[PDB]
Amino acid sequence: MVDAFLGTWKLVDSKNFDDYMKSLGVGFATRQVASMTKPTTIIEKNGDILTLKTHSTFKNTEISFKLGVEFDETTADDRKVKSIVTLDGGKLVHLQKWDGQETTLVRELIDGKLILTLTHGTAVCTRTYEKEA
Numbered sequence: 279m280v281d282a283f284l285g286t287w288k289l290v291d292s293k294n295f296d297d298y299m300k301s302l303g304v305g306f307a308t309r310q311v312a313s314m315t316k317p318t319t320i321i322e323k324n325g326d327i328l329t330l331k332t333h334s335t336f337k338n339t340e341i342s343f344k345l346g347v348e349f350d351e352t353t354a355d356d357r358k359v360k361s362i363v364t365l366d367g368g369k370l371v372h373l374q375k376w377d378g379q380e381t382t383l384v385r386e387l388i389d390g391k392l393i394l395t396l397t398h399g400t401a402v403c404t405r406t407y408e409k410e411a
């Protein structure tokens with residue numbers, strides 16, 4: 279179900295990430311640095327447990343979760359959120375909730391590239407990742 283998402287992915291295109299970060303209240307200096315990083319995202323499974331690593335020269339994160347089971351998460355920008363990840367229409371949908379706010383992180387495979395769509399408020403960011411061999 280999740281298996282074509284698995285592997286190591288590198289950022290190769292980003293649209294509106296500053297808008298997304300600014301909507302979340304990320305400070306200008308953090309948004310500068312983040313606008314020039316190209317993270318590596320690593321998605322692995324072990325049975326029902328998925329681990330998603332995001333690595334860069336600026337911030338690293340790692341989460342582990344079971345699909346469809348809520349988990350606590352502390353995001354790269356230090357939000358303490360309630361999260362759930364599920365498959366919906368073949369897309370991996372990550373919903374974060376905190377302080378009555380939500381944001382979605384939706385991953386879809388198109389022509390072998392992983393497209394991550396980030397939505398918070400009205401801001402919609404699209405980031406494209408290509409698979410590492």
Ligand SMILES: CCCCCCCCC(=O)O
Pocket residue numbers: 299304312317319332353354355394405
């Ligand atoms: C400044 C941090 C905003 C939340 C995480 C952004 C994740 C983006 C990515 O995985 O490409």
